[PDB]
Amino acid sequence: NEDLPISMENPYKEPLKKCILCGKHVDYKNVQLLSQFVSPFTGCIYGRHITGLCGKKQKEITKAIKRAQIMGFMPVTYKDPAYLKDPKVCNIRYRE
Amino acid sequence: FNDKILNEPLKHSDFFNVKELFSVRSLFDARVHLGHKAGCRHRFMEPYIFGSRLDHDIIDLEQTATHLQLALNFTAHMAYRKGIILFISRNRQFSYLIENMARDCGEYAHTRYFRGGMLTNARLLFGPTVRLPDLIIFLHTLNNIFEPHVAVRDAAKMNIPTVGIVDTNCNPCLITYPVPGNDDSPLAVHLYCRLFQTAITRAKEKRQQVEALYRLQ
Amino acid sequence: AGSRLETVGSIFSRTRDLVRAGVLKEKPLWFDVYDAFPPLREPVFQRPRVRYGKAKAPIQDIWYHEDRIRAKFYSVYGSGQRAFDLFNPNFKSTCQRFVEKYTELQKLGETDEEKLFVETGKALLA
Amino acid sequence: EDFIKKQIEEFNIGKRHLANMMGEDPETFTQEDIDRAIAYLFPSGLFEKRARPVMKHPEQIFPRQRAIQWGEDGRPFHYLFYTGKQSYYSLMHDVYGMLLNLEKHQR
Amino acid sequence: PMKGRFPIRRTLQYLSQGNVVFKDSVKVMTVNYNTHGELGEGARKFVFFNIPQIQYK
Amino acid sequence: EDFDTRILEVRNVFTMTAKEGRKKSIRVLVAVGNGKGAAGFSIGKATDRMDAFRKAKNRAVHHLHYIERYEDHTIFHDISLRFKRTHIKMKKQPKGYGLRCHRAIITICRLIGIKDMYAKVSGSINMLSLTQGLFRGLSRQETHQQLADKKGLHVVEIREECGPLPIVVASPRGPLRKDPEPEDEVPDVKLDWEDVKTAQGMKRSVWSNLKRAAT
Amino acid sequence: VESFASMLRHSPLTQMGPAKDKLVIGRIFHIVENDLYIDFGGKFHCVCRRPEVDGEKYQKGTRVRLRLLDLELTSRFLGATTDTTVLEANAVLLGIQ
Numbered sequence: 001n002e003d004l005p006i007s008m009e010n011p012y013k014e015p016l017k018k019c020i021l022c023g024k025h026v027d028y029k030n031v032q033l034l035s036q037f038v039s040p041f042t043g044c045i046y047g048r049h050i051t052g053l054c055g056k057k058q059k060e061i062t063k064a065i066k067r068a069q070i071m072g073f074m075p076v077t078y079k080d081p082a083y084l085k086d087p088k089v090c091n092i093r094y095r096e
Numbered sequence: 097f098n099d100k101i102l103n104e105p106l107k108h109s110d111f112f113n114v115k116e117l118f119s120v121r122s123l124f125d126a127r128v129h130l131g132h133k134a135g136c137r138h139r140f141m142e143p144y145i146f147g148s149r150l151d152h153d154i155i156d157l158e159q160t161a162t163h164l165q166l167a168l169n170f171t172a173h174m175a176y177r178k179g180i181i182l183f184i185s186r187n188r189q190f191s192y193l194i195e196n197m198a199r200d201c202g203e204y205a206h207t208r209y210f211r212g213g214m215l216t217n218a219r220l221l222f223g224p225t226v227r228l229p230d231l232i233i234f235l236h237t238l239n240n241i242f243e244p245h246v247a248v249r250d251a252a253k254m255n256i257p258t259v260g261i262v263d264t265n266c267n268p269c270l271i272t273y274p275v276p277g278n279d280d281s282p283l284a285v286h287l288y289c290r291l292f293q294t295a296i297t298r299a300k301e302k303r304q305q306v307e308a309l310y311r312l313q
Numbered sequence: 314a315g316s317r318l319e320t321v322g323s324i325f326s327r328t329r330d331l332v333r334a335g336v337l338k339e340k341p342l343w344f345d346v347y348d349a350f351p352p353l354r355e356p357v358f359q360r361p362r363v364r365y366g367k368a369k370a371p372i373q374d375i376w377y378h379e380d381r382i383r384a385k386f387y388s389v390y391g392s393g394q395r396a397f398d399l400f401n402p403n404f405k406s407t408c409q410r411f412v413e414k415y416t417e418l419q420k421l422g423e424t425d426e427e428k429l430f431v432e433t434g435k436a437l438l439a
Numbered sequence: 440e441d442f443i444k445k446q447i448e449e450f451n452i453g454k455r456h457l458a459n460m461m462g463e464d465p466e467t468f469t470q471e472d473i474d475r476a477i478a479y480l481f482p483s484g485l486f487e488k489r490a491r492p493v494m495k496h497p498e499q500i501f502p503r504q505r506a507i508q509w510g511e512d513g514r515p516f517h518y519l520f521y522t523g524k525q526s527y528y529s530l531m532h533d534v535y536g537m538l539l540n541l542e543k544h545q546r
Numbered sequence: 547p548m549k550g551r552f553p554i555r556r557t558l559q560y561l562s563q564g565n566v567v568f569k570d571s572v573k574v575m576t577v578n579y580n581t582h583g584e585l586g587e588g589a590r591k592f593v594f595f596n597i598p599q600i601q602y603k
Numbered sequence: 604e605d606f607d608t609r610i611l612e613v614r615n616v617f618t619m620t621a622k623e624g625r626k627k628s629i630r631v632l633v634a635v636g637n638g639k640g641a642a643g644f645s646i647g648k649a650t651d652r653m654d655a656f657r658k659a660k661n662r663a664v665h666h667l668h669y670i671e672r673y674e675d676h677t678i679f680h681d682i683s684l685r686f687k688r689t690h691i692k693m694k695k696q697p698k699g700y701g702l703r704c705h706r707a708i709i710t711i712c713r714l715i716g717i718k719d720m721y722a723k724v725s726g727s728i729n730m731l732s733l734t735q736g737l738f739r740g741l742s743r744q745e746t747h748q749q750l751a752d753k754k755g756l757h758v759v760e761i762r763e764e765c766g767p768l769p770i771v772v773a774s775p776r777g778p779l780r781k782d783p784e785p786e787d788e789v790p791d792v793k794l795d796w797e798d799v800k801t802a803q804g805m806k807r808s809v810w811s812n813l814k815r816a817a818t
Numbered sequence: 819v820e821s822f823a824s825m826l827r828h829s830p831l832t833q834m835g836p837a838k839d840k841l842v843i844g845r846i847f848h849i850v851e852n853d854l855y856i857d858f859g860g861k862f863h864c865v866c867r868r869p870e871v872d873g874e875k876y877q878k879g880t881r882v883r884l885r886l887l888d889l890e891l892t893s894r895f896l897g898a899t900t901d902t903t904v905l906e907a908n909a910v911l912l913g914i915q
């Protein structure tokens with residue numbers, strides 16, 4: 001009776017995984033980060049399966065990219081060649 | 097006057113004293129209490145299961161001990177009354193062990209592909225005057241596609257009692273004596289073979305001494 | 314004769330019934346043994362069904378206070394190079410040493426869990 | 440079977456009669472003696488050698504009838520009975536056992 | 547099956563199984579009842595079960 | 604020997620074949636029973652009707668059921684069962700009522716031994732669902748002894764023929780429960796509009812109470 | 819006498835915690851070509867490739883160390899009602915002793 005199991009919330013519960021920008025403030029003026037999430041050759045916005053972001057963050061990246069491209073902060077058809085040097089965070093592989 | 101050698105075990109509760117053959121420690125060190133995951137559960141093994149530890153299921157060893165006592169008592173009474181017990185498994189890992197256990201005792205083993213109509217179309221498959229087994233023991237109730245066994249269903253068809261080791265992913269629905277325990281590990285399977293072989297043998301010599309006493313009086 | 318209807322009842326019910334009716338002349342070998350020692354549940358056929366709405370399994374999850382403090386141990390001090398055995402009974406691991414000595418500090422009597430952790434950690438170092 | 444037994448007795452008396460019949464009252468009349476004898480006595484002339492006359496012992500004439508596999512208690516003799524392929528599966532089990540204990544030791 | 551929760555309320559023996567036969571002095575019966583609250587449960591069941599019998603007799 | 608076999612349906616059933624075309628295959632359904640409770644139905648299919656009959660009757664005697672009877676003349680209670688699209692309403696009836704039932708049910712219950720019930724079928728009158736629903740209901744009857752063992756109380760009968768004399772039929776085999784049954788005023792039971800129509804007398808039919816032959 | 823719950827709490831497999839990244843010792847019990855069938859305790863056996871370095875001291879009955887990534891290896895797929903069980907655990911062999 002001292003040895004029967006007792007009810008509690010799950011120990012060893014790993015904390016929930018957090019996306020890369022989770023807690024960070026994304027702006028339409030942050031064209032280094034939006035350039036990270038834009039494709040280097042075609043200017044395409046990457047999908048969820050490539051970026052690895054949560055739904056809210058991916059939505060804000062898409063809206064900020066479209067805003068910056070229409071306000072004149074971002075090229076549409078390509079990534080900034082000044083920003084083809086920054087840390088790559090997208091799970092895509094072009095070369096071979 | 098033979099109905100005494102055919103009725104005295106039937107009034108003596110635990111006539112073969114098989115209760116001294118197993119304990120909860122023996123089952124625990126044979127790893128009987130281990131089971132499959134919560135996604136590999138059956139609604140009809142939900143009664144026999146103690147709980148879930150880290151999405152791994154554990155069978156209640158007290159229920160296992162009581163059901164094993166009843167199953168071994170039935171098995172010993174049938175071996176005393178000289179029935180035929182068909183040991184069935186589809187392991188391919190313990191097929192050698194099951195068949196050698198039957199040959200160490202005197203009893204029969206079907207560990208190969210169960211052809212359709214073995215127990216049901218038995219008179220045409222074997223011959224017109226064949227005695228079907230009077231008890232069928234499944235040490236693994238599932239086939240190799242994880243489905244309940246055609247001979248479980250066919251023993252239910254031909255009214256043969258069935259003693260079966262049921263795991264978490266098994267169906268105890270049409271088995272007369274289910275023993276809720278692990279049958280996926282060599283220690284548990286070896287302990288099951290040892291207990292059943294010991295029960296069949298001790299039942300057979302207990303019979304032998306009984307009619308020896310019967311013929312000397 | 315015999316009755317090959319497995320879903321209407323059990324072999325015991327069918328056999329007792331047929332020998333009461335007088336169509337099975339000789340009782341089978343297992344019948345009187347079944348009558349003497351019946352199992353805990355009569356084997357009647359039951360169709361498995363899927364739980365659909367607000368129906369959950371009656372299964373509980375096995376958890377302990379020792380599991381909580383094992384969780385915080387494995388959080389801070391990882392699984393050491395002393396490997397676990399699993400083949401002998403009474404195997405006392407390093408995390409096991411941790412849990413009983415946390416418990417002896419509890420039964421001696423202290424209050425705040427961080428203080429208990431610091432005391433047991435310096436005792437492990439000793 | 441009693442059929443096989445009386446056929447064997449009939450074949451023995453018949454081959455004795457056959458040797459006395461042709462020329463061979465000494466006891467040793469071999470099978471090819473029997474064949475040439477029946478070939479002379481009955482001119483075969485059929486294109487199938489099995490449609491020709493044959494005079495063999497009933498073991499070769501009649502096929503191999505398997506013995507009764509259970510006594511007068513039920514209880515079949517071989518323990519791998521209900522597989523229905525008892526000799527074949529016993530051979531599998533035996534070869535498997537020799538492979539197992541050989542690994543343990545090691546047209 | 548007959549429609550409704552309790553089909554016995556429309557079987558002509560429940561209606562001629564109620565017991566109240568009012569005197570010739572009364573003309574109007576008014577039942578003010580409350581749909582919610584644990585205290586008006588008797589009034590709710592009286593409206594549900596006994597008003598057809600009273601009106602039938 | 605004591606088993607009697609009665610056919611219930613014979614149909615000429617055809618299938619299409621690449622070479623032959625229409626290929627006639629007789630499918631029959633029979634019921635086998637002795638008038639002591641054990642009965643069973645089966646289907647036999649063959650190219651010859653004699654072969655179909657033989658297969659059907661041997662398969663039924665391998666597939667028998669049992670039917671519990673009240674005093675070996677009627678069923679225990681009233682049975683309502685919908686098997687697929689066939690609705691069967693059966694009523695226990697007193698002695699001497701006869702077999703006022705669908706003709707297949709008359710034959711089957713002559714094979715079983717039941718003499719006094721009423722049976723009305725509706726929905727689709729398919730023979731092969733009718734017989735199986737009949738057997739399902741008669742095998743899933745509850746008896747008075749099982750009832751008394753379930754509730755823990757006495758089972759008594761009150762006949763209008765005898766009077767107010769209570770006739771105990773089934774007593775529990777274990778302990779007797781001591782709290783009385785809960786008298787649920789105005790019970791929640793699903794009634795049948797045909798039963799209520801007959802009880803109140805607006806069931807106007809020129810077919811119901813017709814003078815027919817015996818059983 | 820001790821209860822089944824007593825056996826459970828004073829059993830090492832419950833003292834494990836989560837199965838992942840726990841070092842275990844185990845016995846080799848079956849060998850085909852170079853597929854070593856190791857037990858580690860628990861319900862099932864793991865199968866490991868023969869390490870090409872030191873590759874002849876991996877024999878029947880040898881004690882080996884395992885990382886033990888998983889205990890059961892099941893998963894559910896698109897139309898299945900239950901899991902598809904491998905009847906096999908997952909472990910990474912580290913070496914000898």
Ligand SMILES: [Zn+2]
Pocket residue numbers: 018019021022023054056057
């Ligand atoms: Zn996020």
Ligand SMILES: [Zn+2]
Pocket residue numbers: 132263264265279280
């Ligand atoms: Zn299993």
